[PDB]
Amino acid sequence: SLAPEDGSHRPAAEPTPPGAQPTAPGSLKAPDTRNEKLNSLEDVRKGSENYALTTNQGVRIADDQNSLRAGNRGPTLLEDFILREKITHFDHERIPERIVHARGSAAHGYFQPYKSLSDITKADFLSDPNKITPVFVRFSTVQGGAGSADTVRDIRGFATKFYTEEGIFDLVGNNTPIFFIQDAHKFPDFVHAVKPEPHWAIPQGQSAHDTFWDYVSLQPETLHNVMWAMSDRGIPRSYRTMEGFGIHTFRLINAEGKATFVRFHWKPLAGKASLVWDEAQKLTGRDPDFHRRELWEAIEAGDFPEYELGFQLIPEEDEFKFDFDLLDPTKLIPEELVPVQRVGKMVLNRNPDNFFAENEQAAFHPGHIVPGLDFTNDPLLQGRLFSYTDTQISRLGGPNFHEIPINRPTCPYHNFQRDGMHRMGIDTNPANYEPNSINDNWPRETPPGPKRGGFESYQERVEGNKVRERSPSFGEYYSHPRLFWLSQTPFEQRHIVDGFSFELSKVVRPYIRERVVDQLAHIDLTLAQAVAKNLGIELTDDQLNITPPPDVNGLKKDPSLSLYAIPDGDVKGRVVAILLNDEVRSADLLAILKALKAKGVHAKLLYSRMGEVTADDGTVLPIAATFAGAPSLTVDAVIVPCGNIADIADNGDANYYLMEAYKHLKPIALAGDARKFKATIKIADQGEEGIVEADSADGSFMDELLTLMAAHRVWSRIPKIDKIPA
Amino acid sequence: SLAPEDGSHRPAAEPTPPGAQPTAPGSLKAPDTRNEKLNSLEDVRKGSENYALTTNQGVRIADDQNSLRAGNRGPTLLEDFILREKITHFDHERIPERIVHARGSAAHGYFQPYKSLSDITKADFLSDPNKITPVFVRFSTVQGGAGSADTVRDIRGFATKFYTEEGIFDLVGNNTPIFFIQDAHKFPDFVHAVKPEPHWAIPQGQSAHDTFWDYVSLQPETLHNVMWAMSDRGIPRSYRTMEGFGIHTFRLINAEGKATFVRFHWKPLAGKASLVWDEAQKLTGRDPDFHRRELWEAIEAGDFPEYELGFQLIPEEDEFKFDFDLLDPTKLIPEELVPVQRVGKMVLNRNPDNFFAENEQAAFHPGHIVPGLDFTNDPLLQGRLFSYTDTQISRLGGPNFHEIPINRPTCPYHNFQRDGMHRMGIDTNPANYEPNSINDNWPRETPPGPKRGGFESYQERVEGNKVRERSPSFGEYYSHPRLFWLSQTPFEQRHIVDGFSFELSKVVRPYIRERVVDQLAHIDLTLAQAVAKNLGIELTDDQLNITPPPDVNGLKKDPSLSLYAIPDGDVKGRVVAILLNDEVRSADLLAILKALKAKGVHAKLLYSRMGEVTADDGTVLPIAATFAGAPSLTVDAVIVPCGNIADIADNGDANYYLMEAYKHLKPIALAGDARKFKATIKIADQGEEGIVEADSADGSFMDELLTLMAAHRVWSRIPKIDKIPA
Ligand code: HDD
Numbered sequence A, B: 001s002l003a004p005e006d007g008s009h010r011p012a013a014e015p016t017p018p019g020a021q022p023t024a025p026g027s028l029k030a031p032d033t034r035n036e037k038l039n040s041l042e043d044v045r046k047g048s049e050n051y052a053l054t055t056n057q058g059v060r061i062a063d064d065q066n067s068l069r070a071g072n073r074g075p076t077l078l079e080d081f082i083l084r085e086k087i088t089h090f091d092h093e094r095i096p097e098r099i100v101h102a103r104g105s106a107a108h109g110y111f112q113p114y115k116s117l118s119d120i121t122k123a124d125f126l127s128d129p130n131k132i133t134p135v136f137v138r139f140s141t142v143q144g145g146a147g148s149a150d151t152v153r154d155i156r157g158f159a160t161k162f163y164t165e166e167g168i169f170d171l172v173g174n175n176t177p178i179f180f181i182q183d184a185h186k187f188p189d190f191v192h193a194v195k196p197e198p199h200w201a202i203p204q205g206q207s208a209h210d211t212f213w214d215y216v217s218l219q220p221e222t223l224h225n226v227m228w229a230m231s232d233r234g235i236p237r238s239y240r241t242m243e244g245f246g247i248h249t250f251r252l253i254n255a256e257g258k259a260t261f262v263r264f265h266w267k268p269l270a271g272k273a274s275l276v277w278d279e280a281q282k283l284t285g286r287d288p289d290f291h292r293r294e295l296w297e298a299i300e301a302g303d304f305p306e307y308e309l310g311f312q313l314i315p316e317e318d319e320f321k322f323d324f325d326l327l328d329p330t331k332l333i334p335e336e337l338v339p340v341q342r343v344g345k346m347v348l349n350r351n352p353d354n355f356f357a358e359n360e361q362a363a364f365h366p367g368h369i370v371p372g373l374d375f376t377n378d379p380l381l382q383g384r385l386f387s388y389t390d391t392q393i394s395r396l397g398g399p400n401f402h403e404i405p406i407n408r409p410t411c412p413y414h415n416f417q418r419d420g421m422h423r424m425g426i427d428t429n430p431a432n433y434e435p436n437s438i439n440d441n442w443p444r445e446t447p448p449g450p451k452r453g454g455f456e457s458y459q460e461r462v463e464g465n466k467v468r469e470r471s472p473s474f475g476e477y478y479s480h481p482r483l484f485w486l487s488q489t490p491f492e493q494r495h496i497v498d499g500f501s502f503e504l505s506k507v508v509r510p511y512i513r514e515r516v517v518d519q520l521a522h523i524d525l526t527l528a529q530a531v532a533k534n535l536g537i538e539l540t541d542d543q544l545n546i547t548p549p550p551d552v553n554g555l556k557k558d559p560s561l562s563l564y565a566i567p568d569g570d571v572k573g574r575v576v577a578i579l580l581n582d583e584v585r586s587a588d589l590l591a592i593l594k595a596l597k598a599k600g601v602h603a604k605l606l607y608s609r610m611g612e613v614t615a616d617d618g619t620v621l622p623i624a625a626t627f628a629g630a631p632s633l634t635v636d637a638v639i640v641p642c643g644n645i646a647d648i649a650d651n652g653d654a655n656y657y658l659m660e661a662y663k664h665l666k667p668i669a670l671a672g673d674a675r676k677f678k679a680t681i682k683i684a685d686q687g688e689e690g691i692v693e694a695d696s697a698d699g700s701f702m703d704e705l706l707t708l709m710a711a712h713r714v715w716s717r718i719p720k721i722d723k724i725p726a
């Protein structure tokens, strides 16, 4: 027995805040969290406790420490079948990673609609407010490999597998409402341009290189999503604090056959929140797994990520009433023109057991729709339908990928397909064809109907010649980037300018920079001049005379496009760093932890070493991490309680901890003699907005601090940070 | 035509310093750098200029911007074979990454022995000083995926494919002289333990988690390589400044049939040099491709990585004359007892053309030996022989992986093997078996002999029972960790302490830390006490009376195990940051750049924006990067010339540039009014060692700075950096 007698090796099977316990597989951490999909996976789950170590053939292994050899110092013998099996499996562990979105993090949950949508869709999972549909959701980046970092500047993926009673429905979206390109034929072109360059495979997880901006400068259709990626949208605080969109216009079909155009939205319950770039870039080095960890730990804490599903709904006769083409995925539908209507809510409440088996092997594909839903002629969606079935043949080893447990439907599935690599199902049907008499033609077709019917495509009208040709209605590239730009706050605009500037500064060929600046001058001259200034470029008089693009159906801004314009913050699930000293004033800490617990805010107690310290009243305080081990990048605010401040007053890591949080605009709270730290951040004796300070942490100290946290960051501090050396 | 009329899209086909030009595939950058392997690859190289865009079947494409559809706003048609071919190929681009060493960077070069070694080996590539052997070298980390970061704390791989006239020889080594484990049966257990943990797949590129130190604490055989991993050996400055080792004892076999035991060594011509931890960890964020980048650019500069091959040689009759077992791969051979004898030199002088085709698909395997070389009963080596063949069947799609162009021998190869997936060779032999009369038994066996003879194994004697048993001679675990500890300088010992301390602070279960500390007390109680203090752990009296382990055949220490104890630094290929202002003193800059070119030291001119600035004499200075875009992490030293210093005196990024470089112990030179920056780094008016300063950048000023660069870092500055907030 190698476990410790005190049993401290096993985490408790109950919700615990991040860092209190070792993380564990979901069925062990929360065995009583169940749904119909989790239960169906029990047949393939494998335990371990009280079992013998065997080969894959069931043979008990006596000595798992040594190869078989001719003498204890002799050659290894080919007849060691236990070695060779163990090494063979190891030698073939890896499978191809996803072509795009290879880096991702996933969890189980459930979905439930608010009310029956049977008036607009016959889709069964939206027909009754009491119908609960299990889900599996994978969040992702786009460009980086499976081993790349979480907090890069990138688009994020948001893929939801609905295990419906009438088929698997995959909603395969991103965290922005549009994509970079218009036609699927260009997808390898765009992806090759953004991916690491083919001679040397640099850089990983970054669009800040020549070939990406080269493609953008020559393809202005890309400009809208590029705007989004250069904003703080491209660097989310977590997957819980981002939006989701299906991007394409789809169709809803009701029992009477009426089609309604629809676009899908996920609204985060935790609000919209993003990092700032210096923080996001450094965090890819201090913790490349930050988003993966934060997701797992929130679920282990009970901080279940929640999202409200919503629809923008457009009648068929309104197809042409907007300036933009509904079928153009580089165009958004402003919520000011078509509101998002609440449909239901999704809760992610259990982690997987084995990342490889459940996350890496999961297969999402937007062609996986159910009766009540249908496609449109969006030329990007159209080509997606081919790719997501095709790519699985190599990634997941063949055509039986639906038999891998995480991908199996929970509803019945029967047909006349047979064979293929690693076929699990053993068909007893006398027939493998239809029409057949020898099994009385079963399984049988089902006619279309209002529920439990067969799938039939909406009989939309088609008219035109066979052409490789872009619809002229698509050939407008600058109005929607402008609408986005004007909808941002001034500090969000600053960050957009700084994103473009930082990225173009790493383009080596200067003529590429100049061509991207010229495209910006077609969007907004304020934006283009600000970027040009940082690049040492001067706009020509002709460029200064570029007429701006028209408004979007009269709109000159839409505050739903901004992260922060309308407050939607939420402190539940946020984390505060508490910086300890060797004789902490316990009255401060008790007030701090009481206020944080009331709002569901977590705390990390940090010191210069691990182990424990003792407060003034003798209370023993366990240390979560060092100052260097858990930098301010990983928390939302910093609190410094009173006590023996001289212990850390001249500690470089303690001082830098506050300087980093200050530069990154986070709230900071100083109690008693901890107010001496204002000098390291150059805060005058009069104080300033964003620095909570008082004689002690009792009173309004923590309400000021929690109000600041509900506002996410202290945007008013931005003029002051450029003098801070951090 | 989309290129710029001035041709600045294309880099010059001549050696150019890093940053000067865009990087390029090796055949375009250096068309005249040739060897036999590079030349043999011309049959599969594909150009591009002046060729039509086609399908894979050779059909010319007219519109590569659109899918085929029924009307320009209609559905995509299944008959668009151009779309489906292009998407199909994209959908299947990825192949399994390597199970280990998935992250790596490679280059072409050549090798040449100094003299004939026919007295000790009949290996043909070592027979003649005028015999040139082309090579392909891949450097790697171990734990992370192909998309993980370069400057992690890990072991590094160093793999060399020799394309000899008598077969491919692969020398597949690492950058430390031992491995973690003794018997290959344990390799899946160790690797699984160091890799991301199976439930959530965290952490990437790090051994700082519970399962790794759990294994270590339970398997003391691992302590020796762990010590190397926790030293600055784990974080190399670049692949050019690290050693290589084969680790295993092999045999040399001469024409008389005499066996000599040998261990292989690579000695870097650039010397040994490593980062510091805070620097290395931060650099995985600011540039996760730092090592890949530095290697490519050094070769484009003509700054070819060079390595001397050396042998430790031991007569067969001396097999048992050491305190350790020569066949134990957790033991090193001290150079003080067996010197490394120089054999030849290897030069890396051309980058690949396509990273995937040459680097990702390259297959290295230590079973690939040639006549004149042989194996030993090293139980780790013995199991490696199985794995490197087996793993390619899935990783490279089958048994013809030797036909992938990078892997092809340059010498003849003929046998009776046939078929298999993607077979390229078309065999005309009437017979696919031997013995055969119908082709007069060709191709035929060759008897062993002095040159050009068939491979025969050394007929070593084997005596023993079939057993799964570790040799008792392997049962010592602490003498070699001690030897290594005592061989380090005081500041390398400090960095080892901080490496163990940092990593154990990330282990969530405290009993694992305590168990690792107890292991450390069997090596050195000063190391154990210093790590325990940072963990809040108090060693018991029992632990304090653990007897130290004996030394190694009388050796207490061996300075060759230190990175820095013996000076070996070379400044050629290093890089200096030069921080500009808007009116630089041209006399300063002229003298700086003149002295750096004399030593082959590169420079990047940094400013607060892109573009150009003008010197005091009107000289236009082009800016290479911003202060933030090329942080001090990426340079070896910082020079601040005199000028309009008020322009950057209050720039937070400019002051931080110096503070970061200061903390990471790098040389700093300050001319004229730049000396006012001393206050930011808290240097007294009278100065200190490591800070170069004068009225101007002439005189001895550049000599002083270059002397500091030859010493790599200012170790004496360590006591001062703790009080620095950076
Ligand atoms: C025609 C090619 C093509 C095009 C135009 C798109 N995609 Fe895609 N996408 C793929 C081809 C693809 C793929 C190559 O088939 C992937 C990679 C691995 C896989 O299974 O599917 C994929 C993966 C993938 C994933 C990750 C699913 C997971 O977690 O496993 C998401 C979230 C998206 N895509 C979302 C989008 C969105 C929102 C798009 C624009 C509206 C989009 N893709 C356009």
Ligand code: HDD
Binding pocket: A087, A091, B098, B099, B100, B101, B104, B138, B139, B140, B156, B157, B158, B159, B172, B173, B174, B178, B179, B183, B184, B187, B246, B247, B248, B329, B362, B363, B364, B380, B383, B384, B387, B388, B389, B391, B392
């Ligand atoms: C029995 C299993 C096993 C054991 C005990 C080892 N390795 Fe290994 N090694 C492999 C199984 C393996 C592998 C799984 O076969 C790899 C991964 C993919 C491949 O082609 O070979 C590999 C890759 C690999 C590479 C990367 C090659 C490349 O650049 O493509 C290097 C440098 C090494 N190894 C070096 C070592 C050293 C120095 C070891 C100890 C002395 C060692 N390996 C033990």
